[PDB]
Design a protein around this ligand. Structure first.
Ligand SMILES: *[C@@H]1O[C@H](CO)[C@@H](O[C@@H]2O[C@H](CO)[C@@H](O)[C@H](O)[C@H]2NC(C)=O)[C@H](O)[C@H]1NC(C)=O
Length: 361
């Protein structure tokens, strides 16, 4: 059982305790850590922050304590135009150039693999996505000839029925990637003038206009399209989505007037880090969609949908009963990495909850 954990660069700039560096990652916690979003320039992989080579270095030193730990660099991200990916993948010259530039970048900075986070390819991109992965992997194989451990290749895919069918030839890329991370946590977000939970586990017999909007359907589905379970990794959130209530309605379907107010540390409407939620929770009313197995809090005119140790251990058992390759946790830096915000004196509480479940049978 794999536990792939993302670490975002931009989490270093956060003020107060919010600040986080590779520096603060428990080396034995995850099996795979991923540095979040490298860039591409002149059709070549490349850095993003002014200090990535230092942080890269910082992260890969963890491997000196846990020789089994593995690391990867992710490409793309949300602040990276898909157009950009698209343009690079459509021209066999741009693509082959980008590709041939990856292995040496990684070898240089100590990485064991590359992670493609092309955030949402379109109908006109399937054909090339399949290529990129193919050739990319063909390169990675041609280079192990150099007498060094073959590089890993993974992709972060969406979990939206329509998004998938639109730009993913799962059947194909499934035999080239080393593993696939399903983004099972973006089944909502304010552009729905109503409240709702973004990372539910089950459809929950009560509302289906979004039957295909839950981890369960997402997995059943990928499996049918052809992706073997031993390469599928379920994504688990470590943040929560927030909305500003438009009325005194808290119950299912309440009207929303816009996203939630920013967190004292993550400063960003719509989102809250777990350790911020921990602070939010005091004086909040906690409820739980029993049907879907996930909680949600409420305070004043703030409605927050999030995952707690329970819901998280819950999903963890799920991937297990479906015999998947493992779990994926978005944002090590959004969890309580200091272990000083959420009651219990435990560091990385959520990520740990998953690890303990997977650690069993
Ligand atoms: C990622 O690399 C791209 C491409 O080199 C950078 O985008 C360039 O921005 C430069 C300088 O800011 C502009 O003059 C070019 O017009 C941009 N080209 C494109 C395709 O946008 C981008 O700034 C880099 N991003 C980071 C974070 O380093």
């Amino acid at each position: 059982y794999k536990l792939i954990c993302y670490y975002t660069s931009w989490s270093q700039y956060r003020e107060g305790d919010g600040s986080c560096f590779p520096d603060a990652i428990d080396p034995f916690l995850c099996t795979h850590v991923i540095y979040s979003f490298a860039n591409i320039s002149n059709n070549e992989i490349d850095t993003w922050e002014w200090n990535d080579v230092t942080l890269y270095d910082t992260l890969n030193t963890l491997k000196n304590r846990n020789p089994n730990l593995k690391t990867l660099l992710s490409v793309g991200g949300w602040n990276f135009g898909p157009q950009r990916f698209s343009k690079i993948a459509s021209k066999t010259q741009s693509r082959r150039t980008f590709i041939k530039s990856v292995p040496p970048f990684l070898r240089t900075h100590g990485f064991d693999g590359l992670d493609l986070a092309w955030l949402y390819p379109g109908r006109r991109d399937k054909r090339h996505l399949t290529t990129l992965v193919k050739e990319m992997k063909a390169e990675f194989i041609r280079e192990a000839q150099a007498g060094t451990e073959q590089l890993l290749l993974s992709a972060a895919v969406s979990a939206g029925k329509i998004a998938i069918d639109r730009g993913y030839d799962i059947a194909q890329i499934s035999r080239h990637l080393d593993f696939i991370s399903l983004l099972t946590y973006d089944f909502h977000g304010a552009w729905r003038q109503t409240v709702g939970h973004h990372s539910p586990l089950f459809r929950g017999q009560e509302d289906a206009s979004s039957r295909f909007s839950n981890a369960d359907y997402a997995v059943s589905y990928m499996l049918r399209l052809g992706a073997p379970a031993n390469k599928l990794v379920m994504g688990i959130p470590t943040f929560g989505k927030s909305f500003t209530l438009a009325s005194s309605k808290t119950d299912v379907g309440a009207p929303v007037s816009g996203p939630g107010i920013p967190g004292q540390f993550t400063k960003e409407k719509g989102i809250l880090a777990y350790y911020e939620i921990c602070d939010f929770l005091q004086g909040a009313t906690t409820h739980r969609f029993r049907d879907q197995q996930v909680p949600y809090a409420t305070k004043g005119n703030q409605w927050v949908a999030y995952d707690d140790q329970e819901s998280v251990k819950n999903k963890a058992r799920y991937l297990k009963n479906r015999q998947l390759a493992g779990a994926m946790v978005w944002a090590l830096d959004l969890d309580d990495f200091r272990g000083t915000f959420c009651g219990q004196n435990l560091t990385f509480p959520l990520t740990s909850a998953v690890k303990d479940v997977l650690a069993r049978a």
